[PDB]
Design a protein around this ligand. Structure first.
Ligand SMILES: Cn1nccc1C(=O)NCc1cccs1
Length: 460
């Protein structure tokens, strides 16, 4: 039975509004309703992995698992295995997988982050799951961010705290946050970004939604605007939104948006908004294709509609050779030529690099680079041809060209990372000097760039 080179992943996010679900929720797992929907001809084909994020979830873990497994069994006639379940307050993540994947999945991690301080600590935050699927690392984050149209900057702060403090994936990747630890990272939830239009325009917005004319509303969506201005979710993708706003509905119908201020809302307006979102970030040149992104029309117990997204994702096999694992393959080498980091920092410490990759036995520390002043006020750290030659565990090009090198640039004085990035080994040529590039981030904000040339030797 051959190992897959592709899997499909279902991501669901639903703010349940503290109410039990209706008896039938299969439309969610089938990607049916509004937006980019799944073809009827696929309905019996199970996804490989189902990741369900809930917010304001009133069920026990047992109660929800029973509903989820019974839903998937009805659709697919497959009894899914539970990979992980993790709940913080009323924020929950469930990962289910086809039974045939049980002995492909390992290194399962769970964690949560509580956002806010005092007043604002006690209900918002994020839960996450990571694991290995054969050679491929997968991370999943379900966040419920701060509510309210006038709190976009709080949501951005919540995002930065979650990506700093959520402890998933390989703890040896110590310079790297969750935005660099995974081949594929899916981040979803009630992100709570709103359509930023005046309150007086509520009925106009409703009109537009009835006409399925979303363009003038999406141009005011806070998440799209904040992402365009590089304030949040830097280097993440989101499929185009072609479904109606998923909040705030009157319960038991989808015919009415309930936007007006009420005691129950703290006298806040809730103009129709795309609160409920799925974003992802995959390593460079890895196959990832969104095949659905939409909302259900027939699940009406909450003031939010459920959102679905499905993905094709490239995966690799757990490679063994006669040499690695447990030794180097001397027919393999990675040389970084004429590399330099450009940093936004005002500091004047010396810097060194760390190269991290599961194609190495352990991470590699470089010598300190040579600091120069850049023309427009920046720091340029030059590494020349000084960088250590990297010795991969396996030389086979079928393995090595699918790998990635994570780079951290660290201060000699503090050993703290000033920037993290990633280089694909999916090159146009081997034994050939080829340009490489990554942006560098720290705490998920842009701090610089790393560019140079690479020369990759494989056994072929
Ligand atoms: C026993 N258990 N309860 C909850 C989660 C688990 C678990 O560790 N499952 C391992 C699997 C890998 C793939 C399918 S199942």
């Amino acid at each position: 039975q051959p190992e897959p080179d592709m899997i499909t992943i279902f991501i669901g996010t639903w703010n349940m509004g503290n109410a039990p679900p209706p008896k039938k929720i299969t439309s969610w797992f089938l990607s049916k309703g509004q937006g980019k929907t799944r073809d009827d001809s696929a309905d019996y084909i199970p996804h490989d992995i189902y990741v369900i994020g809930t917010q304001e979830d009133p069920l026990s873990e047992k109660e929800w698992l029973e509903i989820l497994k019974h839903s998937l069994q009805e659709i697919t006639s497959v009894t899914f295995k539970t990979v992980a379940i993790h709940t913080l307050w009323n924020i929950r993540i469930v990962v289910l997988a086809k039974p045939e994947h049980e002995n492909r999945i390992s290194h399962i991690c769970t964690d949560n982050v509580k956002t806010g301080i005092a007043n604002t600590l006690g209900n918002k935050g994020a839960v996450g799951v990571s694991f290995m699927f054969n050679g491929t690392s997968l991370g999943f984050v379900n966040s419920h961010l701060t509510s309210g149209s006038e709190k976009k900057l709080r949501r951005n702060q919540n995002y930065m705290n979650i990506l700093r403090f959520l402890a998933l994936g390989d703890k040896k990747l110590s310079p790297f946050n969750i935005t660099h630890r995974f081949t594929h990272l899916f981040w979803f939830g009630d992100l709570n970004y709103r359509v930023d239009l005046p309150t007086w325009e509520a009925e106009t917005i409703i009109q537009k939604i009835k006409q399925q004319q979303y363009a003038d509303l999406l141009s005011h969506d806070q998440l799209l605007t904040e992402r365009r201005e590089q304030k949040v979710f830097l280097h993440f993708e989101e499929e185009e939104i072609t479904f109606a706003p998923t909040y705030r509905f009157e319960r038991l119908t989808r015919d009415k948006y309930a936007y007006t201020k009420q005691k129950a809302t703290g006298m806040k307006y809730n103009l129709p908004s795309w609160c409920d979102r799925v974003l992802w970030k995959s390593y460079p040149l890895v196959h990832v294709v969104c095949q659905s992104y939409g909302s259900t029309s027939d699940i009406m117990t909450s003031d939010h509609s459920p959102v679905f997204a499905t993905f094709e994702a490239g995966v690799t096999s757990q490679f063994v050779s006669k040499n690695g694992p447990g030794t180097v393959d001397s027919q393999g080498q990675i040389e970084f030529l004429r590399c330099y980091a450009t940093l936004k920092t005002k500091s004047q410490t010396k810097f060194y690099l760390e190269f991290h990759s599961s194609c190495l036995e352990s991470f590699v520390k470089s010598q300190e680079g040579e600091n120069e002043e850049g023309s427009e006020g920046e720091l340029v750290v030059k590494f020349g041809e000084t960088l250590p030659k990297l010795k991969p565990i396996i030389s086979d090009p079928e393995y090595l060209l699918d790998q990635h090198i994570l780079i951290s640039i660290k201060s000699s004085d503090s050993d703290e990372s000033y920037g993290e990035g990633c280089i694909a080994l999916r090159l146009e040529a081997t034994e050939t000097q080829l340009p490489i590039y990554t942006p560098l981030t720290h705490h998920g904000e842009l701090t610089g760039h790393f560019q140079g040339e690479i020369k990759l030797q494989t056994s072929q």
